[PDB]
Design a protein around this ligand. Structure first.
Ligand SMILES: Cc1cc2nc3c(=O)[nH]c(=O)nc-3n(C[C@H](O)[C@H](O)[C@H](O)COP(=O)(O)O)c2cc1C
Ligand SMILES: Cc1cc2nc3c(=O)[nH]c(=O)nc-3n(C[C@H](O)[C@H](O)[C@H](O)COP(=O)(O)O)c2cc1C
Ligand SMILES: O=C(N[C@H](CO)[C@H](O)c1ccc([N+](=O)[O-])cc1)C(Cl)Cl
Ligand SMILES: O=C(N[C@H](CO)[C@H](O)c1ccc([N+](=O)[O-])cc1)C(Cl)Cl
Lengths: 189, 189
């Protein structure tokens, strides 16, 4: 059931490293992005997938110091304790090329790219949940962008949009409420 | 298989009205939105679901004339021929309230709302594909926004983002290529 798969995806903050088949996890991350739609099949999403030492480095050597410096002008341990982090970027070189090819609709491509980032982020999140792995989505962009690009030698054109922290589920999702259907769905014949 | 469900979703332009259980279709549309994540559980997505006479009216009485007037300053028959159209909006009143509650991060909420629209659009699209129904995603916003709001008495705060045309599959999806994995995925340990 696709709907059941959607329901199974939740924000899990308590994450560990009890992950049995990392190769299968990577395969599924790639597939979830591969089969996601993007405007004009532009495929603007880019991923940096960090585990092990690189996972430790992101949180200890980049996020923590950047955040401290930012604040001046715990939760991090929880993120570090996870198995890995998937950093989602949108390739601005491709967006700019589309804007150049289709000037009358230049305003659309950044919007559709942003939508595209949401799309691939949740498809990956849901795919991970199907494997029994939890995840949560963070936003320490744009603070960490430069340091991340330098450390992993990323193209300047990759614009960081989100960081999906993932791993084994160590405690259940919290409670979550839903709006009244009547306030968000209108059906007319 | 969640990945298989993703692969099964495609852009289908040749759509008909050979839909067996409209109530089940509506149920699934609602569920796909219900179980989609949004920042702060803000649930900013709003849907207008049109079938039958309302489907005819949208394309014949709103999109066609607006587009003509716009151009001055076929494909439409293909959209009209579908069973229905799901118009996706984002509730700007909720976005503004979040911006007010969290002023330091006011810039984030419009971005996350845009991502949210992508998220619910593709979750609905994929859910429909699981039922064997095809769909395609159009963007005649902002040209049709005012006329749509007036005809179906929608709140001013609903900002139209996309229109998912759906129905029975009358011809297969076209060919689609994929980028080289090496150009969009980096894995580091
Ligand atoms: C676009 C987007 C941005 C989000 N931003 C964050 C964030 O920065 N930090 C965080 O902890 N959760 C974040 N969330 C998680 C949402 O708060 C969560 O998805 C929502 O409360 C629904 O709960 P669920 O994921 O368990 O279904 C984000 C979700 C989405 C879709
Ligand atoms: C954010 C977004 C906007 C899109 N805009 C349009 C559009 O306005 N008109 C259209 O015919 N297709 C549109 N598409 C469809 C894409 O071109 C299509 O998803 C892509 O070529 C991949 O093909 P597939 O949907 O068969 O997998 C859009 C897709 C996405 C995700
Ligand atoms: O072709 C364009 N717009 C047409 C006009 O109706 C249409 O809206 C459209 C938009 C996106 C698209 N896509 O993502 O493949 C296809 C057609 C421009 Cl965005 Cl270049
Ligand atoms: O709380 C905020 N930011 C924190 C700071 O780290 C964090 O980025 C966050 C963002 C979104 C979120 N959500 O969508 O529920 C939760 C925490 C503001 Cl956006 Cl109000």
């Amino acid at each position: 059931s696709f709907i059941k798969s959607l329901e199974n995806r939740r924000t899990i903050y308590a994450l560990g490293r009890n992950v049995q088949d990392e190769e299968k996890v990577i395969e599924t991350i790639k597939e979830a992005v591969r089969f996601s739609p993007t405007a004009f099949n532009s495929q603007t999403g880019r991923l940096l997938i960090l585990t092990g030492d690189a996972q430790d480095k992101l949180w200890d050597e980049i996020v923590a110091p950047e955040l401290k410096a930012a604040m001046e002008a715990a939760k991090l341990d929880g993120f570090k304790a996870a198995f890995g982090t998937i950093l989602f970027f949108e390739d601005q070189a491709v967006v700019k090329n589309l804007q150049e090819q289709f000037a009358l609709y230049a305003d659309n491509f950044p919007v559709w790219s942003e939508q595209g980032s949401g799309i691939i982020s949740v498809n990956v999140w849901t795919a991970l949940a199907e494997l029994g792995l939890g995840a949560n989505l963070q936003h320490y962009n744009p603070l960490i962008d430069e340091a991340v690009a330098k450390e992993w030698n990323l193209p300047e054109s990759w614009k960081l949009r989100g960081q999906l922290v993932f791993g084994s589920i160590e405690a259940p999702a919290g409670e979550k409420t839903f709006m009244d259907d009547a306030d968000r769905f209108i059906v007319a014949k």
